[PDB]
Design a protein around this ligand. Structure first.
Ligand SMILES: CCCCCCCCCCCCCCCC(=O)O
Ligand SMILES: CCCCCCCCCCCCCCCC(=O)O
Ligand SMILES: CCCCCCCCCCCCCCCC(=O)O
Ligand SMILES: O=P([O-])([O-])O[C@@H]1[C@H](O)[C@H](O)C(O)[C@H](O)[C@H]1O
Ligand SMILES: CCCCCCCCCCCCC(=O)O
Ligand SMILES: CCCCCCCCCC(=O)O
Ligand SMILES: CCCCCCCCCC(=O)O
Ligand SMILES: CCCCCCCC(=O)O
Ligand SMILES: CCCCCCC(=O)O
Ligand SMILES: [Mg+2]
Length: 279
């Protein structure tokens, strides 16, 4: 059948200069960490120690600076436009926030994205955005984000926005979280572990099983963080849509192998990241 489109997601892309670095190695997507200040305002694109093996953990920008850089990379006609960069996953580090600030955090995020990424609707960046939340109890962040876009007069930008709960929770628990949030599509399901530690495929298989069942809730599945060819082949054999990596060129090389070229292709802007793939 048709080739499954694959998102090769550059991991921990937190300095503006790293956008080109990862995209030029073959990434069509990037993942970026978002720290929050004491008021639930996004503050930095900062991961900090501990981080993935072989990586500098401390590259960062003021969050709005990174957003303007991301906008340049994703706005057709810009000197720095990268046609290939089509999805951004914001890893919202909401661990520093009280649970009752989750909604506020969503609103502040929407304000920053609207102002600095989507440029108030004036020739904004075109990439699809996944809001990745590490704690199921922070689901009210989603409603906050939405409600803020709506108040600012850009509710249509939600068409470009999707969702992830990244905490490796039980899949049934994740589904219940979405049910509470009233979310019924644009769902990516992360599964993984730092590149420093070994992991099996049981939960990723279960996420794929949910995605491909008639009444499942997951649209796309991604595995993280994968820096090895063997692991890449395993994840692709398992049927994942996305692979998050410190080395996009490693993933690219595997996808360019004759056997894999026949079953997979690098996703482009016209592949809707919210739509479950069918052969
Ligand atoms: C919107 C200004 C961002 C800077 C925040 C500094 C003061 C903290 C605000 C408390 C959060 C209440 C949620 C408001 C959402 C909003 O309208 O920004
Ligand atoms: C290959 C034997 C098992 C892997 C050992 C765990 C290693 C931690 C993750 C980093 C592995 C990536 C391999 C080198 C990356 C590269 O291609 O430059
Ligand atoms: C982009 C070319 C696709 C069609 C190629 C037919 C399959 C043969 C591929 C053999 C592996 C060579 C890897 C080259 C990857 C590339 O740059 O396209
Ligand atoms: O893999 P994922 O669940 O999307 O989120 C990632 C992991 O949770 C881990 O914290 C890491 O290295 C990156 O900072 C995050 O992207
Ligand atoms: C109703 C019992 C909750 C089932 C588990 C839901 C998963 C996370 C949701 C946290 C919010 C708790 C609540 O108000 O339901
Ligand atoms: C829970 C976040 C962990 C990020 C990955 C850090 C790698 C392991 C470091 C350690 O030994 O502690
Ligand atoms: C939190 C739900 C976000 C999805 C936004 C798209 C549809 C919203 C329906 C509505 O207008 O209320
Ligand atoms: C480099 C791969 C070339 C295709 C050979 C086998 C084609 C097939 O699947 O029928
Ligand atoms: C497609 C609907 C997504 C949210 C519902 C999650 C579930 O199936 O329990
Ligand atoms: Mg991260």
């Amino acid at each position: 059948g048709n080739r499954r489109p694959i998102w090769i997601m550059g991991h921990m892309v937190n300095a503006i200069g790293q956008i080109d670095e990862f995209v030029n190695l073959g990434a069509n997507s990037i993942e970026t960490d978002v720290s929050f200040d004491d008021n639930a305002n996004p503050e930095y694109t900062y991961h900090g120690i501990p981080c993935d093996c072989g990586r500098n953990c401390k590259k960062y920008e003021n969050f709005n600076d990174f957003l303007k850089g991301l906008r340049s990379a994703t706005t057709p006609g810009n000197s720095k436009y990268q046609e290939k960069l089509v999805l951004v996953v914001f890893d919202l580090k909401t661990g520093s926030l009280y649970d009752n600030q989750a909604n506020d955090a969503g609103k502040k995020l929407a304000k920053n994205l609207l102002q600095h990424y989507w440029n108030n609707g004036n020739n904004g960046g075109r990439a699809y955005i996944v809001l990745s939340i590490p704690d199921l109890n922070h689901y009210p962040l989603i409603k906050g984000f939405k409600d803020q876009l709506t108040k600012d007069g850009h509710p249509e930008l939600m068409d470009k926005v999707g969702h992830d709960f990244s905490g490796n929770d039980d899949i049934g628990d994740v589904g219940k979280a979405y049910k509470k949030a009233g979310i019924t599509g644009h769902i990516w399901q992360s599964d993984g572990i730092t590149n420093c530690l070994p992991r099996g495929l049981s939960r990723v298989n279960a996420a794929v099983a949910n995605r491909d069942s008639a009444n499942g809730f997951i649209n796309k599945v991604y595995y993280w963080t994968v820096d090895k060819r063997s692991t890449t082949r395993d994840a692709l054999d398992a049927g994942v849509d996305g692979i998050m990596t410190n080395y996009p060129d490693v993933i690219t090389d595997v996808l360019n192998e004759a056997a894999y070229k026949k079953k997979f292709r690098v996703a482009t802007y016209d592949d809707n990241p919210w739509v479950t793939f069918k052969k």
